[PDB]
């Protein structure tokens, strides 16, 4: 259960293809009401996750 931007980034270093931790990051950004930031990191999730996981795409 990550709570800050630094441990969020470190857990994305854990897995950058993890749609789970991507989703928790953008969900935290919606609850803190930074919608452009959550949308942009969703684009970052697009350009960072792999091509085998069409389900998580």
């Amino acid at each position: 259960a990550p709570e800050s931007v630094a441990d969020f980034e470190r857990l994305l270093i854990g897995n950058p293809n993890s749609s789970v931790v991507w989703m928790n990051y953008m969900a935290f950004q919606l609850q803190l009401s930074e919608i452009e930031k959550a949308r942009e990191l969703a684009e970052r999730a697009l350009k960072t996750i792999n091509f085998r996981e069409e389900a998580e795409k």
Partner: peptide, 9 residues
């Protein structure tokens, strides 16, 4: 740095 503001990539 607008496309990557923290340096994951």
């Amino acid at each position: 740095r607008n496309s990557d503001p923290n340096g994951t990539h």
